[PDB]
């Protein structure tokens, strides 16, 4: 009821990957109940980025996920006050990232304050050499670990040369308001796509479709 069927999205990301500093702005719309969102991104500082845009893209809100009536929707119940998440990304060649987002809502707009820090990417690796093509579609497993709603996902970045480059996501999610009830364990299928880009990925349009389910 706080959440409307059509919502706007405003975003700023600040960050640092292998010592390279950057600022990216986002402006988007989505449909919370249909699990669908898209966003226009614009690098404001630090471009052209010297690393694969793709590592960033899952950091640019689990409110945009279609929940059936039989799974508690922790994210939609967190509003208007909102919620935050923190995520670790562990890549198979030793690259590591920590991201966080603090999400708030004013009227019909979600505001997102995002931080992204990456380190230990090898200079000869697919991320620093810009050899990535896309994330494969994924299934996040949602469960409770020590009172905290936790999502794990085994992700795969398709590289040039038909190889995959693997990484493990762990995200913890916390409602701002005390006493929003935790859900039971469940799944969310995701698909994320770059729809269009310019030469150095200074402008990117992004799309995500997500659906919650009980595994059947």
Numbering used by the authors: 2 to 61, 65 to 220
Question: How is this structure described in the published paper?
Answer:
The mGeos series of rsFP’s display similar switching behavior to Dronpa. The series was developed from mEos2, with mutations that remove the undesirable irreversible green-to-red photo conversation, increase fluorescence brightness and provide high thermal stability of the off-state. Skylan-NS represents a further improvement, with reduced per cycle bleaching and higher photoswitching quantum yield in the on→off than Dronpa. We present high resolution room temperature SFX structures of Skylan-NS in both ‘on’ and meta-stable ‘off’ state collected using two different XFELs, the SPring-8 Angstrom Compact free electron Laser (SACLA), Japan and the Linear Coherent Light Source (LCLS), USA.
We collected datasets for the dark on-state using two different methods at the SACLA/EH4 station using the DAPHNIS chamber. For comparison, we obtained complementary data using the droplet-on-demand method for the dark on-state, using smaller crystals than those used for the grease method, which were delivered in the crystallization mother liquor. The hit-rate could be carefully controlled with the crystal density, and levels of 40% could be sustained with crystal densities of 4.8 × 107–9 × 107 crystal/mL. Table 1 shows the CC* and R-split values that reveal data from the droplet method was lower quality than that obtained from the grease injection method. The comparison between the two on-state structures collected with the grease injection and droplet methods under the same conditions (Black) showed the lowest R-factor over the intermediate resolution range up to ≈3 Å resolution. An increase of the R-factor for the increased resolution (<3 Å) is likely indicative of genuine structural differences between the grease and droplet methods, in agreement with the observed degradation of R-split and CC* when merging intensities together (Black). The R-factor for the on- and off-state experiments using the droplet methods (green) (but at different photon energy) is considerably higher than the two off-state measurements conducted at different facilities, including the lower resolution reflections. Following complete refinement of all four datasets, both on-state structures showed no statistically significant density in either the 2Fobs-Fcalc or the Fobs-Fcalc maps that could be assigned to a trans chromophore structure. The same was observed for chromophore omit maps, that also, at lower sigma levels, did not show such density. This is in agreement with the dark incubation and dark sample injection which corresponds to a 100% on-state concentration. Photoisomerisation is clearly seen in a comparison of the “on” and “off” refined structures where the dihedral angle of the chain connecting the phenol ring to the rest of the chromophore (N–C=C–C) changes from 1° (cis) → 171.1° (trans) in the on- vs the off-state and the pheonolic oxygen is displaced by 6.2 Å.
